[PDB]
Each structure stands twice: as C-alpha cells, then as structure tokens.
C-alpha cells in the first residue's frame, strides 16, 4: 500500500516535524485521521509505522477496562487518559472498532467504541494552551465507514480519510516478499507466480502461506523452503478460509 504512506505523512508527520509551516500559512492543526477497509489490509501496520518515524509515543487503548489497574477504571476515563498522555507527549492515541469482540457495544450507538472516539475528540479541540500547536493527534480505525454516525463526518471534524483497497496482484507480490525475507528460500522460486495462483483477499492470509510453508518443511524434514511447499500451503490456507467465510 504505497500510495497510502504519502497521504497520512501529510497530516500526521509534518505538523510535528515543522510546527512552523502550519503557523505561517494560517492553517488549523489537523486532528482526526480515520482509516477504513477490509481487515488484514494493513490499516494498523501503517499506524505503528508513522509513530516510529516521527518519534511519538504510541498509546494503544482497546476499550478494555481490565488492563487499567493504576487508575483502576476505564469507566469514567476520558481526560484521565490525557493526563497520562500529556506527560509522555508527543502522543498518538489509537482506538479501533473491533466489532467482533465487544459486538454488543456497537449496537444502537453508531459504535459503543465510538463513545470513546467522540468524547476524546471533544476534549482535544480546545485544551490548555496547546492552541499554538498540538502534541496529541488522534487516530480512529473502523472496518467499515458505514457505522460511524454523522457527528464524526461533519466538515472540519476530521481532516483526512484513508481508504485501503484489498491488495492487487501487483501488491500481493511485494507483501509476500517482506514475509519471505525472514525465512529460507530456494533458487528459482517465483514468488510472483504463487501470488497470482493464490486468489486471496488479505495480507493476513498472505502471511499465513509463509508460516504454513514452514510447517510442510518440518514434516518432511527438508533443509529449505522449496517450490512444492508453497503449492501445498496455498491450498491449506485457501480451503480453511473458504469454509469459515462462506
């Protein structure tokens, strides 16, 4: 997903690296950046990547109240996260609508995970004296944009909307190679021909072809990941995905 790296660099990376470009023009700071697409197309992976390059803290909040033991609660927490965020800033608060664990919160509210997004966005438009330039951005992830209620799509509320298409046959080849660099190869293997044959739909699936190829390496006690292993792997991964997805 090469195009998407360039669009989120604009709104997130640049106002941290240069708070002067945004003062000079007279442009308001960007706040929210909403990421949406099919799971596995890597909307989280890009998030971790931008945080590392700018050099900001990455605070993942899942909506769970269990992990909170120092405050005690995530029940009345909104600003109580920000108190901890302001000590360790610059920060990127991350929130993901999982809608498969905690599916009963989504109901009847445009996301019960969006209660977290809107309340935290409200404190962030006007807080303290970070009106000159803010050191906390806010990033929201949703499988689908359908769920988000209109009070998060108004003009001026977010600032950027990233879309992630499922990978093309060209993209699959690149993504399959990043996972193959970690493990052995054999001369003559065309990682391109295995991406085409694999219909697929996700990059999560693609990573499972590599791990499954390593499983076929153990049973025969090979010394190298060979061309036969990928053909068996593609099948095992595709058949398991089609029985659960249909």
């Amino acid at each position: 997903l090469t195009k998407q790296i360039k669009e989120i660099k604009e709104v997130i990376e640049l106002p941290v690296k240069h708070p002067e470009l945004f003062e000079s023009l007279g442009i308001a700071q960007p706040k929210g950046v909403i990421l949406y697409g099919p799971p596995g197309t890597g909307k989280t992976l890009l998030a971790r990547a931008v945080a590392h390059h700018t050099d900001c803290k990455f605070i993942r909040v899942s909506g769970a109240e269990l992990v909170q033991k120092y405050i005690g609660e995530g029940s009345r927490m909104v600003r109580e996260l920000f108190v901890m965020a302001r000590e360790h800033a610059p920060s990127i608060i991350f929130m993901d609508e999982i809608d498969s664990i905690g599916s009963t919160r989504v109901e009847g509210s445009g996301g019960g995970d969006s209660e977290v997004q809107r309340t935290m966005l409200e404190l962030l438009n006007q807080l303290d004296g970070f009106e000159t330039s803010k050191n906390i951005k806010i990033i929201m992830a949703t499988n689908r944009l359908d769920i988000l209620d209109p009070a998060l799509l108004r003009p001026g509320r977010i600032d950027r909307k990233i879309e992630f298409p499922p990978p093309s046959v060209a993209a699959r080849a690149e993504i399959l190679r990043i996972h193959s660099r970690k493990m052995n190869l054999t001369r003559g293997i065309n990682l391109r021909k295995v991406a085409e044959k694999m219909n697929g739909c996700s990059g999560a699936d693609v990573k499972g072809v590599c791990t499954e190829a390593g499983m076929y390496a153990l049973r025969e006690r090979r010394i190298h990941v060979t061309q036969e292993d990928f053909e068996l792997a593609v099948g095992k991964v595709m058949n398991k995905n089609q029985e659960t997805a249909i």
């Binding site: 007279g26 509210s109 809107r118 303290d128």
Partner: protein, 385 residues
C-alpha cells in the same frame, strides 16, 4: 516606568526595616514567643515522632473524641489533641495519628484528588468574542445571563430582580454552539468546569447518580462557576449497551441531574450552559422554565452574515492578489459556518501539497467544489418545496 520603580524602592526597604524591628523585640520578651516558642516546636515534633499513621476519621463524637479507622484493621476510640482545628475534622477526612498511643495530632493534608482535576479546564482558548462573524444579536442574549452579573452585580440589585439562571444553546449543526461557549468562558474568568453528556452513562449500576452528584459539588465549592454540558442530547438518543441497567438506569440518572440543578440543595452560584442540537429528545422536565430561564436559538447563517465569517478565516491566511472573496460566498447557497472553516483549511492544505506559501485562486476553487459534494443537502426542507 520612572514612578513605579521609585515607589517600589521606598516600600521594599521600609518593609525590610519593620520586620527587623518586630523580630528583635519579640525575642527578648518571654510573654510573646521566645521561651514557649523554642520548646513547643521541639516538643511537639519529638513526642509523637514517626511513623505518623494516616487513617480516616469514620465519625466524630462531640466531646473531643473520635472513632478512626486504620487501614491495618484495628479501630480506635482516640482523643483529639493539640494543633488541630476540631471543626475541620469531619467524616471522610484523613487524619495523622500518633503511633505510640493513637491520638489525632493533626491534619496537614491538602487531599488533592483526580476527581477535582478531571472536571477542571486550565482553558486558554485563543478565541475571544468577535471571532464569531455576525450573529451579533445572539451573542447579546448569552452575555446578559452569564457574564454580565459578574461584571456589574449592581444593576440587578438596584432593580430588585433575581438574575436569570441557565441557558440552552440549540439549533442547526455548525452555528457555533461550542464556539459561543468558548467566547463566554474566556471573559468571565470564573471556574469553568466542562463535562460532556456522554460520560454520564457508564457500565456499573447506580454509578450514574454518584458521578452526577460529584460534578455539582466541585462547582458549588468554587463559586462563581460555569458548568457546560456538551450534547446532553447524547444520553436520550443513544443506547451504548455497555450499561446493563438498560433504559431504566438512564432514567434514574436523569432524575438525579434534575435535583442537583435546582431541587432542595440551595447551592451557591452555578450558572449552567446546556448545548444541544435537538431539543425535542430532551426530557420536558429538564428544559422547564425555572431551572433554565432563556432558550437561545440559532439559525443557518445568511448571505450577508457569511461575509463576516469568511473575513475572519481569510485574515489569518496568506493570499495572492488573484483571489476574489466574493465568488466563494455566492456559489454556496445556505451553507453553515462550519463548512466555511473547512473550506479555508482544505485550500491551504492543497497549496501545501504543491509547496507554495501563497494560497492562490485555484486552491480555493478546488476546495469549495469538494466541500459541497461531501455535504448531504437536507431532505427535511426538500420534502417541502
């Protein structure tokens, strides 16, 4: 400059001199400090020593005795000794105990809480009144209720009329319900507590009233105060389904908010701002005129008003001479002031992708067109004509 330094120089060496005179001639007289003073501080410290055990005063008995609870389990019928204000000790208060034989040797404790800090805004918004382009009439219904009785409490007391209490800022989205709250919160320099209406639904049962009783107690202590409740619409309309008390729970919490707002308490000075976008949903008991006094209403900015709004966002901006402000106003026909702000922000972003400081005429025309498509008309007044 000249005279302010000159008078300070005389006052600050005259202060020096008087403090030296009081110190020398109250140390040679034993009836004031001297002999009692150098023995009480050393004795008080030494006798009780350390560790001082913190506990909680469970309740106080009128006879200078108390029942205090150590976290280590043993309760104690203690006595209340030297160097403590006995009116300051009340249920809930934390006390310091003398560890050899348990007696309250005092409370030195601020007892600062994250419960008071969460309500509190350290606000310094760059917004002041007249960053609201026009809608001047509406500004001067809000200032007469909230700000003015703090500036001149003389006018209402001469007249003999009780100040108006409460306001509701409602209307179409984008008319600046939040932007007005920020203007009026900046001027007053009263304690401005902020609490979004969504927070009043939480998962546990019966916590809603405990949370609602807490907010107003911080405010009454900090008079004069403002309590802004942003989108109190949110509790009626939504159903987060985290709270397993269901709809019954939301109703019992609402009834708590009604009592804290007027009820029996007879609280101190607490103005309330209630922002909402849909006044229909709101329970009719809340809106009732007696708790709120004036219901301000807004409407969609006009074509003459939109010129004022645009002038505010285009002033900060750098422009070329090729831009024409007037052709950006007329094309849009009835579009709120939130969209005008985004139209400026979108243009400056296109010019920053091309990497030229100036925002030319073309960046404005591409931005304006993109913002009309993003909107969604209004099938409420389309039905009509």
């Amino acid at each position: 400059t000249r005279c302010k330094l000159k008078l300070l120089r005389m006052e600050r060496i005259k202060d020096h001199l008087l403090l030296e005179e009081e110190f020398v001639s109250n140390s040679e007289i034993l009836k004031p400090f001297e002999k009692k003073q150098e023995e009480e501080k050393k004795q008080l410290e030494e006798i009780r020593g350390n560790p001082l055990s913190i506990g909680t005063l469970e309740e106080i008995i009128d006879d200078d005795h108390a029942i205090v609870t150590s976290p280590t389990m043993p309760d104690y019928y203690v006595s209340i000794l030297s160097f403590v204000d006995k009116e300051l000790l009340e249920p809930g208060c934390s006390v310091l105990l003398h560890h050899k034989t348990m007696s309250i040797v005092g409370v030195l404790q601020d007892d600062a809480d994250p419960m008071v800090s969460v309500m509190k805004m350290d606000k310094s918004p760059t917004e002041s009144y007249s960053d609201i382009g026009g809608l001047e009439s509406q500004i001067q219904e809000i200032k007469e209720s909230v700000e003015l009785p703090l500036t001149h409490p003389e006018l209402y007391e001469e007249m003999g009329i009780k100040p108006p209490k409460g306001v509701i800022l409602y209307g179409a989205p984008g008319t600046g319900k939040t932007l007005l709250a920020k203007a009026v919160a900046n001027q007053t320099s009263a304690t401005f507590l902020r609490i979004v209406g969504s927070e009043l639904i939480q998962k546990y049962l019966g916590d809603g009233p405990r949370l609602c009783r807490q907010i107003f107690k911080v405010a009454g202590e900090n008079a004069p105060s403002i309590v802004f409740i942003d989108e109190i619409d949110a509790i009626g309309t939504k159903r987060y389904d985290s709270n397993s008390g269901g709809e019954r729970e939301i109703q019992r919490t609402m009834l708590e908010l009604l009592n804290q707002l007027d009820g029996f308490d007879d609280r101190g000075d607490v103005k309330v701002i209630m922002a909402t976008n849909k006044i229909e949903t709101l329970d009719p008991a809340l809106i009732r005129p007696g708790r709120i006094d004036r219901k301000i209403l807004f409407e969609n900015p006009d074509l003459s008003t939109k010129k004022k709004i645009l002038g505010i966002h285009t002033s900060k901006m750098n422009l070329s001479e090729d831009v024409n402000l007037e052709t950006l106003v007329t094309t849009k026909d009835d579009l709120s002031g939130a969209d005008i702000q985004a139209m400026c922000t979108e243009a400056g972003l296109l010019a920053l992708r091309e990497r030229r400081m100036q925002v030319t005429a073309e960046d404005f025309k591409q931005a304006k067109e993109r913002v009309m498509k993003n909107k969604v008309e209004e099938n409420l007044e389309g039905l009509y004509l």
